[PDB]
């Protein structure tokens, strides 16, 4: 019973912007920590940013920092990923994630894994 419903994901030319969203039907106030990671072909998966139930506390993996935002509306459920002058190794497929552990955001420990999202950055 806990889904975790993504969207935004596609095709984009470099240096365009996605919003990637995930959404959590029901009563979510148990999961502390959502986030989202991402896993390329060949490459390991790798945290990309998180934020705790109250908005207030976020982190990102490096490479992103200054191009994401994550933010967290909890009236309508949703966890939102802005993400701005994307790029060829930004490609990969991203995964929603969310955990109860009061744990650092970028701990990888999360129990509840989305089904994922393709995200491809086309530099043609």
């Known amino acids: 019973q806990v889904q975790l419903q993504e969207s935004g994901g596609g095709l984009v030319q470099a240096g365009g912007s996605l919003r990637l969203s995930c959404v959590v039907p029901?009563?979510?106030?148990?999961?502390?920590?959502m986030g989202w990671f991402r896993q390329a072909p060949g490459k390991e998966r790798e945290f990309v940013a998180g934020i705790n139930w109250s908005g207030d506390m976020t982190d990102y993996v490096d490479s992103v920092k200054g191009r994401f935002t994550i933010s967290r509306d909890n009236a309508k459920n949703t966890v939102y990923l802005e993400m701005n002058s994307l790029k060829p190794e930004d490609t990969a497929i991203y995964y929603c994630?969310?955990?109860?552990?009061?744990?650092?955001?970028?701990?990888?420990?999360?129990?509840?894994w989305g089904q994922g999202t393709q995200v491809t950055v086309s530099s043609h």
């Open positions: 029901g009563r979510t106030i148990s999961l502390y920590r």
């Open positions: 994630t969310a955990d109860p552990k009061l744990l650092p955001l970028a701990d990888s420990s999360y129990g509840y």
